[PDB]
């Protein structure tokens, strides 16, 4: 309504104020209503004029005309228009409102949504609606009106104020009892867009609010959200499923009671059913960014319930084990048709499920995964069955060690973290694993050794000429053995001793001397990872282990090579040079009178050649001026690391080595000093 050229000065001074007057004062709803539509037209051009002039009248006429549907509807449209000037195509900025309820409160397909807008004018409207506890209560009462647009416009307006003044709006909404129950009931609304919009407002309201988390939980919401998810096609739903999952996430995050509620009320079978969607003989599940995000959000919900350090973790872990969830997430980890971004997430979810739980770990050790066909399989029974069952632990070790090219580094470190979750705080399972692993090595060195791969001893004690093409294979191997060797670990001595007393044939010969030969041979290797892995391993092994120091010292030829190697041009290989130096120092510190290279003989041999100053210097130089110096002191931020020209992660040091060095840096540096 109007014309094209209307000078601002007449509109502000004469028309809007007159219309504001008519909205509040006309004694005929008909003319009040009509004044609102007059304001609604000016709201597109003269937003702020109408906010200043129009707002209090609009809100006053809204409390008066609240039983009149056309009156309520026209005022709600007008406020929504006023909320933002806005770049986009909708004057009511409803797209912006939904996007704020998602981005502010959930994790959405980042690629698929590459998108301040809120003014002093927004905040004016937001405070006008917020100061008034009664206006909030009025809006809530509008959900009883039998009008689609009013119910939707009310949800949207509340989303707008929750995106601008959440604490006041959340405060007001809680004050009305019955308020949440009503919101949850919008999920049953006959009209789909009210159901959809209500998931977004629920996300906004329960976010960072334990009070609302418990309030929403008591409204039987899990049952509702899971029917919407199955009704929209599960993982193959798009945003509504993301919203449903995102809302399930916000109701459980940091709410143990809500978590134990979710598990005990028959949700697991539902979550399992949804997680299990991508695995069918029938179709080839179609993967895109939305379905990746849906499943990962689903996996995250499993993870929440079993966050380590909470008192309920064991309970939750045990609960998840008493369903199909573990088996289903391990299918997602191992199945062929699974995106790279999903595999690691499934692997670390399983790791949270089993970490430090005998019952979870002992069940884990019995899980087998179906595989298809070998060489020369006649499908007929007489030849056999083309299906083979492989133990999950074997696949982890295989993927960890030999799955370069086909699997991402992230999957390989997830495999490493799941294995550590499996062995965590379970000495018996650690011992049985190593003992089984040494048998298999003795078939590769004795029975058929001299006339798929999952053996750590094979890697640690054999020479691979092409190791430079898969350096991380060695890095993982040393990192698992250091993990086992932890001094602070219960009965680590037994595990050290089993690894020490292994004999081989390569390049009979015990583990520490075989690794020594492998080390010295490695000082000339393309990848500096290879030498760092052996060096840090042996330093770790020798540190506080007299029998390991004696095995090392029992071969003067190796100490000669290491001393020779330590003499390099001042800039050439300062990291190897210091690690070699550190090895000899540490070997000195746990040398005794009856070490095969006697202490005082080995002391003279090291001190005369290198010097008490040059040693201490090269320990100090290792901390401050080597590869070691620039490592982030993160226990679990080796996932998604920085890359090389070659394309290799910038990962050199196992965390156990870093912890050992940092915790005894003084003792290392002063090994040659003072001691006899």
Curated annotation (Swiss-Prot):
Localisation: Cytoplasm, Cytoskeleton; Cytoplasmic vesicle membrane; Endoplasmic reticulum membrane; Golgi apparatus membrane
Domain of life of the source: Eukaryota
Residue ranges of the region described as Globular head: 1-676
Intervals holding ARM repeats: 41-85, 120-163, 166-206, 208-253, 254-305, 307-355, 356-422, 424-474, 505-541, 543-587
SUBUNIT field: Homodimer. Dimerizes by parallel association of the tails, resulting in an elongated structure with two globular head domains side by side, and a long rod-like tail structure.
Protein function: Required for protein transport from the ER to the Golgi complex.
Family per similarity comment: Belongs to the VDP/USO1/EDE1 family.
Note on domains (UniProt): Composed of a globular head region and a rod-like C-terminal coiled coil domain. The rodlike tail sequence is highly repetitive, composed of a heptapeptide repeat pattern characteristic of alpha-helical coiled coils. May form filamentous structures in the cell.
More about this protein: Present with 2330 molecules/cell in log phase SD medium.
Protein name as it appears in the record: Intracellular protein transport protein USO1
Lineage: Eukaryota, Fungi, Dikarya, Ascomycota, Saccharomycotina
């Amino acid at each position: 309504q109007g014309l094209i050229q209307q000078p601002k000065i007449q509109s502000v001074d004469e028309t809007i104020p007159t219309l504001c007057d008519r909205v509040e004062n006309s004694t005929l709803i008909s003319d009040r209503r009509s004044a609102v539509l007059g304001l609604k037209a000016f709201s597109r051009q003269y937003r702020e004029s109408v906010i200043a002039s129009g707002l209090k009248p609009l809100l006053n006429t809204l409390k008066r005309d609240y039983m009149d549907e056309d009156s309520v509807k026209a005022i709600l449209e007008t406020i929504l228009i006023l909320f933002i000037r806005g770049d986009g195509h909708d004057d009511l900025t409803r797209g912006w409102i939904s996007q704020q309820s998602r981005l502010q409160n959930g994790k959405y397909p980042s690629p698929l949504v590459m998108k301040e807008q809120v003014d002093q004018f927004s905040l004016w409207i937001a405070d006008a609606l917020t100061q008034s506890e009664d206006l909030i209560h009025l809006l809530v009462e509008f959900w009883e009106i039998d009008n689609f647009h009013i119910r939707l416009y009310t949800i949207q307006l509340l989303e707008a104020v929750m995106a601008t003044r959440p604490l006041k709006a959340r405060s007001a909404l809680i004050s009305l009892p019955t308020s949440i129950s009503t919101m949850v009931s919008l999920l049953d609304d006959m009209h789909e867009p009210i159901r959809d919009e209500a998931i977004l407002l629920l996300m906004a309201v329960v976010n960072d609010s334990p009070h609302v988390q418990k309030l929403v939980a008591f409204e039987n919401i899990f049952e509702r959200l899971f029917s919407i998810i199955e009704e929209e096609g599960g993982l193959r739903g798009s945003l509504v499923v993301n919203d449903c999952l995102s809302l399930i996430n916000n109701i459980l995050k940091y709410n143990t009671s809500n978590q134990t509620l979710f598990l005990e009320t028959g949700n697991l079978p539902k979550l399992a059913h949804l997680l299990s969607e991508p695995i069918s003989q029938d179709e080839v599940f179609f993967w895109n960014d939305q379905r990746i995000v849906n499943i990962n959000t689903a996996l995250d919900i499993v993870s929440l319930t079993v966050e380590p350090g909470n008192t309920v973790t064991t309970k939750h872990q045990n609960a998840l084990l008493d369903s199909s969830v573990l088996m289903v997430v391990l299918r997602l980890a191992f199945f062929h048709n699974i995106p790279k971004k999903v595999r690691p997430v499934a692997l670390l979810t399983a790791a949270n499920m089993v970490r430090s739980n005998e019952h979870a770990q002992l069940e884990f050790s019995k899980i087998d995964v179906p595989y298809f066909d070998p060489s020369l399989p006649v499908n007929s029974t007489a030849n056999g069955g083309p299906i083979k069952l492989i133990p999950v632990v074997s696949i982890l070790i295989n993927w960890m060690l030999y799955a370069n090219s086909v699997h991402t580094f992230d999957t390989r470190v997830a495999c490493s973290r799941l294995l550590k979750a499996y062995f965590m705080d379970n000495f018996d399972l650690q011992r049985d694993f190593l003992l089984k692993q040494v048998q298999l090595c003795n078939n590769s060195t004795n029975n058929v050794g001299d006339n798929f791969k999952a053996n750590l001893f094979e890697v640690l004690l054999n020479y691979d000429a092409e190791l430079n093409l898969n350096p991380f294979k060695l890095f993982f191997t040393t990192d698992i053995f250091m993990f086992f060797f932890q001094q602070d670990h219960k009965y680590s001595e037994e595990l050290r001793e089993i690894t020490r007393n292994v004999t081989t044939g390569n390049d009979p010969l015990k583990a520490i001397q075989t690794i020594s030969e492998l080390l010295t041979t490695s000082l000339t290797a393309a990848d500096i990872r290879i030498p760092i892995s052996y060096l840090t391993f042996l330093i770790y092994w020798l540190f506080g282990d007299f029998k390991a120091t004696n095995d090392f010292l029992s071969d003067k030829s190796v100490i000669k090579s290491l001393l020779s190697f330590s003499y390099q041009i001042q800039d050439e290989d300062v990291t190897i040079k210091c690690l070699v130096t550190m090895l000899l120092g540490v070997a000195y510190e746990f040398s005794s009178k009856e070490s095969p290279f006697p202490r005082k003989e080995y002391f003279e041999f090291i001190t005369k050649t290198l010097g008490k100053d040059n040693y201490a210097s090269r320990i100090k130089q290792f901390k401050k001026d080597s590869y070691f110096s620039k490592v982030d002191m993160n226990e679990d931020s080796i996932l998604t690391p920085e890359l090389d020209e070659t394309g290799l992660p910038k990962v050199y040091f196992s965390t156990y080595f870093i912890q050992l060095f940092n915790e005894n840096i003084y003792r290392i540096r002063t090994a040659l000093s003072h001691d006899p």
